[PDB]
Design a protein around this nucleic acid. Structure first.
Ligand SMILES: [Mg+2]
Ligand SMILES: [Mg+2]
Ligand SMILES: [Mg+2]
Ligand SMILES: [Mg+2]
Ligand SMILES: [Mg+2]
Ligand SMILES: [Mg+2]
Ligand SMILES: [Mg+2]
Ligand SMILES: [Mg+2]
Ligand SMILES: [Mg+2]
Ligand SMILES: [Mg+2]
Ligand SMILES: [Mg+2]
Ligand SMILES: [Mg+2]
Ligand SMILES: [Mg+2]
Ligand SMILES: [Mg+2]
Ligand SMILES: [Mg+2]
Ligand SMILES: [Mg+2]
Ligand SMILES: [Mg+2]
Ligand SMILES: [Mg+2]
Ligand SMILES: [Mg+2]
Ligand SMILES: [Mg+2]
Ligand SMILES: [Mg+2]
Ligand SMILES: [Mg+2]
Ligand SMILES: [Mg+2]
Ligand SMILES: [Mg+2]
Ligand SMILES: [Mg+2]
Ligand SMILES: [Mg+2]
Ligand SMILES: [Mg+2]
Ligand SMILES: [Mg+2]
Ligand SMILES: [Mg+2]
Ligand SMILES: [Mg+2]
Ligand SMILES: [Mg+2]
Ligand SMILES: [Mg+2]
Ligand SMILES: [Mg+2]
Ligand SMILES: [Mg+2]
Ligand SMILES: [Mg+2]
Ligand SMILES: [Mg+2]
Ligand SMILES: [Mg+2]
Ligand SMILES: [Mg+2]
Ligand SMILES: [Mg+2]
Ligand SMILES: [Mg+2]
Ligand SMILES: [Mg+2]
Ligand SMILES: [Mg+2]
Ligand SMILES: [Mg+2]
Ligand SMILES: [Mg+2]
Ligand SMILES: [Mg+2]
Ligand SMILES: [Mg+2]
Ligand SMILES: [Mg+2]
Ligand SMILES: [Zn+2]
Lengths: 60, 98, 117, 24, 78, 155, 127
RNA sequence: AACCCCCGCCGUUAGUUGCCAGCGGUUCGGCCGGGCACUCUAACGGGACUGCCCGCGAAAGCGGGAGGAAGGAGGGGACGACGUCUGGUCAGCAUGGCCCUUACGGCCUGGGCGACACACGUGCUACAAUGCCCACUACAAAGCGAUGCCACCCGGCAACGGGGAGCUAAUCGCAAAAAGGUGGGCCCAGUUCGGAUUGGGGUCUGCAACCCGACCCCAUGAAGCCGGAAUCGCUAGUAAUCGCGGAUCA
């Protein structure tokens, strides 16, 4: 229940509300931002790689 | 008449390029109001630093979107064709109204 | 005066008086006043006798209440009781009727704490 | 209080406008 | 609480309406517990599901506006 | 608080009498940062101050605060073993903070409904002597003189 | 003729325009004794005047906006201080010693993560 | 430590933000003429270094004073050593070994994670008069919105429904910020405090609100008169208190 489950979230062969968020890299379901389409985890890895342009370690 | 908007992430390049246009357009045509730095759009994103049970010490960063403004009042063709081949951006968002 | 035919709010503002009537609240309190032309601030004690009948006749006929109201609310439950629905069975075990918490709290429908352990 | 499901302070806290508060 | 169109899965009526013809039986397994009890549904026997099995719950004119699921308990300790 | 003696926090003088003491007393009345009421409420009392007595509220306040200024109190200690209640001196800074606290605390202890009348009556009775806030002062002063025995360990 | 001075405090900012005249003073419409009715610290911003005696000798049209009400009065407390010190150099001699010329760094602290109010930590336990 | 960021003072670059500050006009709303003063706006700089006076001292440095928006780290953040906890997570992902393979894998419908005789943690709302209610009136910051936020008028007690303008946004909207100001009523009562509970009626989302959503209106109004032993946070724009935003998402 991990691969056939990320596949389920892709086809959308059925009703509206049933479709839901999902991470692009991993396949997470919770803590998945729409902006990037990524889970909070990898987003932090990538943001440390600079692979997310404009993003920078904020501080104030 | 003509107007230009320059949204961009890296304010470093968006500041120098905002200068380039003012350099040419002015020194070859009508009057051009100086660069107006608009209020920046900012999207922060706090996120649990760890991959698990550690709801605190969570790291957070931002994604600024700077805006700069410049206006060419009279569409002199002398500036029109130069500001159409002299430019050379890399990540700036230029737009033009009328 | 004995307005509700049984209930007897007195010696305090009329607008709050009928509130103490069962089946009457803050809303119908403000309505009954206007729907019979009556000063809200005036006290129940010092008031026109004719007005007494007026306020009484109105509310006592406009909408049912009291013992018959209570038996009405109780009937709506009696049916649930006999009907065999999930809504009634929560009145049965005495549990909440909103599917709300039961692992904790819900003391209001469970009464005081039974403890034991 | 901020708990009364039927008043100003209540709708202010609850996040709704409702009858007991202005609208359109 | 829903008001425009008192929803109730079609396969419910599609199965029971033919019963309204020759006034046939009532034995039939069901799943649309989220459906309303049809006004014309009186006098029948839809075995509602609860996650374990079908409850042979009989209907009466008193149980109508309510959902068909109500009369099919899910928690095993009623 | 182990390092320095920590500078005493200076407060802005009154915008009605110019004395820092008045505002300090105002702060104890205050609640949840609602400093608006406290000032008003204090002056509200002053209004009732003159109505009752011909005295000005400024002096009656200073008289009330003085009569509730505890000269000595008791503080617990550990003699490397047991635990007495040593009687001893009282810092000037403290005498005020207390004379104001008890004043406010005892102020609310009164039966009256409106707060201002409670602080007005309290301030009168305090300036007089029969004030309840004055009792919390007369009372504490005893504790000290009773234990005058354990004064040897004054430190 | 005129005078001027800005006043910042808590996002709030204020331009102070001075003009010789009566006691007339009004910020952004509304009589001053109306834009600060019921508020006791109202006369605070005007305090800078009682120092120079010019309480009854000057008028003022003020433009203040941003931040909360009370913080504004302090912005004017400094805005006016910058004013009468402007078109009057040697007036400074007895205006800084009295303390009226300072931005007042005091500002609201940013809420921290793992906290409740930048400092108020959550309820500790062990059970 | 310092080099980076926000917040304090200031200057230069910038004029669709801003102001009769300046004159004119005005349907007297910065709406028009008009200007960069100011406010604001986001770029680069300037300034603070025990540099100056005094007392001690070998020095480092400390104590006091002047000037300064700001003095010895000005306030806040980012940043957390060699390591320790056989700490945490193979369920985010990766991975050695191990196990199943018409199955320990896959599809759906319905159920459960929402179960309640209890116990602990974290929290919300209150027990009221420094208060509650109703009407009127003023002041924020930071944020988000084109199959999305919706001004304005109509219906409705209301949530909402319909018509319909503006807006790839310092130009339009979410948008009354609340406490507070003024006015008015309540007069110490389990009360106009308190809204738990529940009966009935109803709006929205979404195939679908029994299990199991949220919101509105009427009615019903519980425990609770400051909390046993014990225990928590906070040293300044902090605690306390008041309201607003966003992520997540039908
Ligand atoms: Mg799989
Ligand atoms: Mg979803
Ligand atoms: Mg609990
Ligand atoms: Mg509408
Ligand atoms: Mg209902
Ligand atoms: Mg219906
Ligand atoms: Mg078919
Ligand atoms: Mg705060
Ligand atoms: Mg210069
Ligand atoms: Mg003019
Ligand atoms: Mg002039
Ligand atoms: Mg005119
Ligand atoms: Mg204009
Ligand atoms: Mg003109
Ligand atoms: Mg520049
Ligand atoms: Mg320094
Ligand atoms: Mg030096
Ligand atoms: Mg030196
Ligand atoms: Mg010498
Ligand atoms: Mg040396
Ligand atoms: Mg030497
Ligand atoms: Mg030397
Ligand atoms: Mg020194
Ligand atoms: Mg810091
Ligand atoms: Mg470091
Ligand atoms: Mg049990
Ligand atoms: Mg335990
Ligand atoms: Mg109102
Ligand atoms: Mg209004
Ligand atoms: Mg405003
Ligand atoms: Mg945005
Ligand atoms: Mg969209
Ligand atoms: Mg219309
Ligand atoms: Mg409607
Ligand atoms: Mg209407
Ligand atoms: Mg609509
Ligand atoms: Mg229409
Ligand atoms: Mg259109
Ligand atoms: Mg726009
Ligand atoms: Mg617009
Ligand atoms: Mg708006
Ligand atoms: Mg009582
Ligand atoms: Mg009474
Ligand atoms: Mg359906
Ligand atoms: Mg109680
Ligand atoms: Mg404990
Ligand atoms: Mg500390
Ligand atoms: Zn991921």
């Amino acid at each position: 229940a991990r691969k056939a489950l990320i596949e389920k979230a892709k086809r959308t062969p059925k009703f509206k509300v049933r479709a839901y968020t999902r991470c692009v890299r991993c396949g997470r379901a919770r803590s998945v931002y729409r902006f990037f389409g990524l889970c909070r985890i990898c987003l932090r890895e990538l943001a440390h790689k600079g692979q997310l342009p404009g993003v920078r370690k904020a501080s104030w | 008449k003509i107007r230009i908007k320059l949204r961009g992430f890296d304010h470093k390049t968006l500041d120098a390029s905002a200068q380039k246009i003012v350099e040419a357009a002015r020194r070859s045509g009508a009057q051009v109001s100086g660069p107006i730095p608009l209020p920046t759009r900012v999207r922060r994103f706090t996120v649990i630093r760890g991959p698990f049970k550690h709801k605190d010490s969570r790291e957070h960063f931002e994604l600024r979107t700077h805006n700069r403004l410049v206006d060419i009042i009279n569409p002199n063709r002398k500036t029109i064709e130069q500001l159409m081949t002299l430019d050379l951006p890399t990540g700036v968002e230029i737009e033009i109204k009328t | 005066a004995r307005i509700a035919g049984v209930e007897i709010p007195r010696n305090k503002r009329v607008d709050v008086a009928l509130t103490y009537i069962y089946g009457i609240g803050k809303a119908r309190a403000k309505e009954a006043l206007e729907k019979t032309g009556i000063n809200p601030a005036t006290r129940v004690k010092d008031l026109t006798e004719a007005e007494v009948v007026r306020l009484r006749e109105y509310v006592e006929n406009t909408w049912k209440l009291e013992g018959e109201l209570r038996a009405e609310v109780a009937a709506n439950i009696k049916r649930l009781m006999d009907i065999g629905c999930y809504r009634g069975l929560r009145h049965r075990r005495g549990l909440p009727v909103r599917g709300q918490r039961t692992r904790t709290n819900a003391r209001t429908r469970k009464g005081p704490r039974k403890t034991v352990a | 209080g901020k708990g009364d499901r039927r008043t100003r302070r209540g709708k202010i806290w609850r996040g709704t406008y409702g009858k007991y508060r202005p609208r359109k | 609480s829903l008001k425009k169109g008192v929803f109730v899965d079609d396969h419910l009526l599609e199965k029971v309406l033919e019963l309204n013809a020759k006034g046939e039986k009532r034995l039939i397994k069901t799943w649309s517990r989220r459906s309303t009890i049809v006004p014309e549904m009186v006098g029948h026997t839809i075995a509602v599901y609860n996650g374990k099995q079908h409850v042979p719950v009989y209907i009466t004119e008193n149980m109508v506006g309510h959902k068909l699921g109500e009369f099919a308990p899910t928690r095993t300790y009623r | 608080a182990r390092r320095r003696r920590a500078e005493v926090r200076q407060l802005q003088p009154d915008l009605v009498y110019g004395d820092v003491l008045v505002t300090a007393f105002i702060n104890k009345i205050m609640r949840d940062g609602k400093k608006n009421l406290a000032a008003r409420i204090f002056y509200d009392a002053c209004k009732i101050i003159q109505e009752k007595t011909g005295q000005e509220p400024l002096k009656v306040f200073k008289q009330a605060v003085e009569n509730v200024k505890p000269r000595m109190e008791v503080r617990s200690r550990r003699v490397g073993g047991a635990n007495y209640q040593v009687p001893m001196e009282v810092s000037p800074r403290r005498q005020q903070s207390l004379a104001l606290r008890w004043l406010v605390q005892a102020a609310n202890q009164r039966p009256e409904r409106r707060a201002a009348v409670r602080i007005a009556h309290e301030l009168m009775d305090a300036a007089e002597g029969k004030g309840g806030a004055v009792k919390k002062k007369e009372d504490v002063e005893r504790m000290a003189e009773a234990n005058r025995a354990y004064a040897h360990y004054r430190w | 003729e005129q005078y001027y001075g800005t006043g910042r405090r808590k996002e709030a900012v204020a331009r102070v325009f001075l003009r010789p005249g009566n006691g007339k003073v009004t910020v952004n419409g509304q009589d001053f004794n109306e834009y600060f009715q019921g508020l006791v610290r109202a006369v605070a911003a005007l305090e800078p005047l009682r120092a120079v005696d010019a309480l009854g000798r000057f008028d003022a049209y003020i433009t203040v906006r941003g931040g909360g009400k009370s913080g504004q009065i302090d912005a004017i407390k400094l805005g006016i201080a910058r004013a009468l010190v402007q078109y009057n150099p040697d007036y400074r001699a007895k205006l800084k010693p009295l303390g009226f010329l300072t931005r007042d760094a005091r500002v609201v602290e940013r809420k921290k993560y793992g906290k409740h109010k930048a400092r108020r930590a959550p309820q500790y336990s062990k059970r």
